Amino acid sequence: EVRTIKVFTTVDNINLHTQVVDMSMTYGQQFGPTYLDGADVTKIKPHNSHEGKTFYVLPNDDTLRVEAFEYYHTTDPSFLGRYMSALNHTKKWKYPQVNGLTSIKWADNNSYLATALLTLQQIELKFNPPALQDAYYRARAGEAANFCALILAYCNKTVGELGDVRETMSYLFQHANLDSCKRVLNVVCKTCGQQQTTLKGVEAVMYMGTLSYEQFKKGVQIPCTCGKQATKYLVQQESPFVMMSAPPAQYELKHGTFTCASEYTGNYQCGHYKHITSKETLYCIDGALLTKSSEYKGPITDVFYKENSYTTTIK
Ligand SMILES: [Zn+2]
């Protein structure tokens, strides 16, 4: 009009798109929903200090649609808005190094994210979306704000919302390369006989029902459709880790028999997570807080174990 500045729009913060904006109109009137490092500036008119800065927008043409899918591996229409909304919060969190790992200082009910982030740094896992690759690299270095906002966006969780570690890990594992992972199970019923099943990928590394990998190898009791209790046990495992999950229950964690674990104190509407890692001793990381003990007992929900190749001796 009479007065303009040059800004750049983006969906991935790498590929920039030159724009000339009218300082008399809001960003929303010109771009649609618009964000400046997570802050919603849709209703704001351009400032002088905005010249040359990069703004996120929603993927509103074909070029941006392709850039956003290639970077994030999602076409959920609300993804970018939810990522920006989360980032406006996570950029204000603190990410202390605790016993050599990036943690998160407690804020905004984020304890499930802290133990998920701590867990990732202890298992062998490679992400597929460049957005996660790039943000996870930064998180390992201690700048985890973008990674944490992406976890929230990928899980369709908002800042402050109750989260579950197992479900969160499931979303992240969908976006990781677990194609090599393989699990063979056998289920034995004294009435019906035996039935083997093979699982691949994410389903090959997660199990819900018991925390103990050794018990999974010996056999766990599950219902059979005939009504009797059958025994399910692990026949073969090919993966760099496994994750064993269960409803929270008092459970004893022995030094040297697991990699790390999550503990949940509370109920189905309200609770708090802590992280336990087995190193030279047992360390309990609760956000920024750190304690140690030689033995540990608590309401454990998830335990992670190292693996490479396992074959049963059960005939
Ligand atoms: Zn049966």
Map out the domains of the chain as residue ranges. 4-57, 58-181, 182-308
Q: What is the phi-psi region of residue 150: left when phi exceeds 0, alpha when psi lies from -120 to 50, beta otherwise? A: alpha
What spacing in Å lies between the alpha carbon of 230 and ligand 1's midpoint?
A: 7
**Packing angle between helix 111-120 and helix 145-154, nearest 10 degrees?**
110
Between CA 234 and CA 35 the distance in angstroms is: 49
Tokens 């905004």 label which residue?
A: 108
Establish how many alpha carbons lie within 13 A of residue 209's alpha carbon, considering only the half-sphere containing its beta carbon: 11
CA of 252 to the centre of ligand 1 (A): 32
Backbone angles phi, psi at 193, to 5 degrees: 95, -155
Question: How far apart (Å, rounded) are the C-alpha atoms in residues 287 and 103?
Answer: 6
What is the Å distance from ligand 1's center to 220 Cα?
A: 15
* CA nearest neighbour of 136 among 121, 124, 154, 158: 121
Look-up of token digits 């093979």: 198
Pairing of strands 282-286, 220-223: unpaired
Torsion of CA 207, 213, 216, 222, to 10 degrees: -50
DSSP 8-state code for residue 256: T
* Distance (Å) from CA 245 to ligand 1 centroid: 25
How many angstroms does the Cα of residue 287 sit away from the middle of ligand 1? 46
Whole-number Å distance between alpha carbons of 30 and 25: 7
What is the DSSP-derived secondary structure letter of residue 167? H
Interval between CA 196 and ligand 1 midpoint (Å)? 14
C-alpha 227 – ligand 1 centre gap (Å): 6
With beta carbons less than 8 A apart as the criterion, state whether 102 and 117 touch: yes
Instruction: Say if residues 189 and 141 touch (Cβ distance below 8 Å).
Output: no
**What separation in Å is there between the alpha carbon of 236 and the centre of ligand 1?**
23
Superfamily of structural domain 4-57: Papain-like viral protease, N-terminal domain (3.10.20.540)
- Report how far ligand 1's centroid is from the alpha carbon of 225 (Å): 6
Alpha-carbon distance of 286 to 261, in angstroms, equals 12
Segments in the chain forming alpha helices (H) = 27-31, 62-72, 79-90, 111-120, 130-141, 145-154, 165-174, 202-205, 213-218
Q: Which residues, 6 or more positions from 202, have their beta carbon under 8 angstroms from its beta carbon? A: 170, 173, 174, 176, 178, 181
Q: Which residue has the tokens 């369709």?
A: 156
How far does the centroid of ligand 1 lie from the alpha carbon of residue 186, in Å?
Answer: 13
Å from CA of 209 to ligand 1 middle: 19
Q: Is 271 within 8 Å of 264 (Cβ atoms)?
A: yes
One of 1.20.1250.20, 1.10.8.1190, 3.40.109.10, 1.10.490.20 is the CATH number of 58-181, namely 1.10.8.1190
- Using CA atoms, how far apart are residues 171 and 181, in angstroms rounded to an integer? 16
Instruction: Tell me how far the alpha carbon of residue 192 lies from the centroid of ligand 1, in angstroms.
Output: 4
- Name 80's Cβ contacts closer than 8 Å, sequence gap at least 6: 11, 56, 57, 58, 59, 68
- CA proximity to 305, closest of 206, 176, 185, 170: 206
Structure's resolution in angstroms? 1.7
Q: How many CA atoms lie within 13 A of 91 on its CB side?
A: 10
Type of residue found at 33: P
CA 8 remoteness from chain centre = 30
The whole-angstrom separation of Cα 197 and Cα 202 is 15
Could you tell me if 291 and 314 are in contact, meaning their C-beta atoms sit under 8 angstroms apart? no
Q: What method did the depositors use to determine the structure? A: X-ray
Q: Which residues make beta-bridge pairs with 196?
A: 186
H or E stretch including 241? Answer: strand 241-254
